[PDB]
């Protein structure tokens, strides 16, 4: 496979994709900000279990508009008024606007897009607005000793409103699964593994292995997750993993390394 390869500046070439790579990407970012549309575009080869996805959100008098799109063909990432589908609450952590109650309305520009609500703590914190991820209609999150991710998703007007989701205010499931992260050496080692109390709808015991895309090490995690969160696609973008294992189960402690 070969994909067009262009940096922010825009100098382009044909990248012979390395062994394993089978998808060509085009990440487009946009920033409207009081009368100036700012477009940056990266293209390159990219790893599998990736999907077309986009997120648009309002920071004060600005709009940030993320987009990525992929396909399997050779050089598939080559070349590529007022629309109104869904009213979605929006804000951001980049100006502590989501953290407060300054919750603007953002109209979805595409029929597929849905109202989102994410929270991301280790490794912006809070985000709200319009976007698309595959099979989205519904909520799905995860947490362990330190990390906490969540992503609600809905298709009706202003459905992503109300207070900001904090892990602390959520109840206890009763489910207890093991909490670790790292490599099976110094990381997810059996003494380094331990029991935590699951929360909210995250009542599945989860383990997920893979490889940290930035540096060629492998990497593992365990904790409490939703069923929908149990998914090969979703852990690979929350933690930049790929070539993944994702096991899930509903017995308190069926996580444990021994039980892999």
């Amino acid at each position: 496979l070969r994909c067009m390869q262009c940096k922010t500046n825009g100098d382009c070439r044909v990248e012979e994709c390395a062994l394993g790579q089978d998808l060509c990407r085009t990440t487009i970012v946009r920033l409207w900000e009081e009368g100036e549309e700012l477009e940056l575009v990266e293209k390159s080869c990219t790893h599998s279990e990736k999907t077309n996805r986009t997120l648009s959100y309002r920071t004060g008098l600005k709009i940030t508009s993320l987009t990525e799109v992929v396909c399997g063909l050779d050089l598939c990432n080559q070349g590529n008024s007022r629309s109104r589908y869904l009213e979605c609450i929006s804000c951001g952590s980049s100006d502590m606007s989501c953290e407060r109650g300054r919750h603007q309305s953002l109209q979805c520009r595409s029929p597929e897009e849905q109202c989102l609500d994410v929270v991301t703590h280790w490794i912006d914190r809070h985000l709200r607005g319009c976007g698309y991820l595959p099979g989205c209609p519904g909520s799905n999150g995860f947490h362990n000793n330190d990390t906490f991710h969540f992503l609600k998703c809905c298709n009706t007007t202003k459905c992503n409103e109300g207070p900001i989701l904090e892990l602390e205010n959520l109840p206890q499931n009763g489910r207890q699964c093991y909490s670790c992260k790292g490599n099976s050496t110094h990381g997810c080692s059996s003494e380094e593994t331990f029991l935590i109390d699951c929360r909210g709808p995250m009542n599945q015991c989860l383990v997920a292995t893979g490889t940290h895309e930035p540096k060629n090490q492998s990497y593992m995690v365990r904790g409490c997750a939703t069923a929908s969160m149990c998914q090969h696609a979703h852990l690979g973008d929350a933690f930049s993993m790929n070539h993944i294992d994702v096991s899930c189960c509903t017995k308190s402690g069926c996580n444990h390394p021994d039980l892999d």
Partner: antibody
Amino acid sequence: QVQLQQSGAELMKPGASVKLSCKAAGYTFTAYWIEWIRQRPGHGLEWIGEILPGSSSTNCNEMFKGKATFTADTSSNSAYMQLSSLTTEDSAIYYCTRDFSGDRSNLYFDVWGTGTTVTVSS
Amino acid sequence: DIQMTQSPSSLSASLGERVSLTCRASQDIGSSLNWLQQEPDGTIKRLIYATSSLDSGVPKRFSGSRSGSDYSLTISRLESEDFVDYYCLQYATSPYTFGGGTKLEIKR
């Protein structure tokens, strides 16, 4: 209170132009597009076009190319629609409503003028 | 240009009877469809915005709902005041379009 006030009924010789108006009240005039809707006798509602005061920006249904022409005077909180080269079939009621420029669905097509009659005949 | 196919064009019913009318979009328009009510004197008022949201002061027997491409306005316990013309309006993408209207009748 919020209001959209419309010009009087017009009786017109075919081949003329007439300028209907929709005077706004109660709200920030520039924050909302003004929409023009035609309704012919015993016929249904059709969308003519729109214009955002106080901007140079307007849209229209393609069918009304050459017929409908939109302007607005912010001083007077007034929006206008000229219909040029009139025929029989321009005989209709013409309502104006508002469509908020921002996002906030509750403020779209929420309040309505009560219409202007235009009758064209020899 | 999107089109909306409204039905029924004409409908007769009695007091108490629940009724429903429907607009079908030729393309996806999200939840961005509104419903309109026109009085015999030509006066137009809005009842439902964004598919399901009720207008303020509108009596709660009126209600909105989508199913796929079919967005459906529903009245439960009819009143004499309700027997009038109704239209849907999509504002997803200009040129914006309307239904062909529905005339409501009292059954005698």
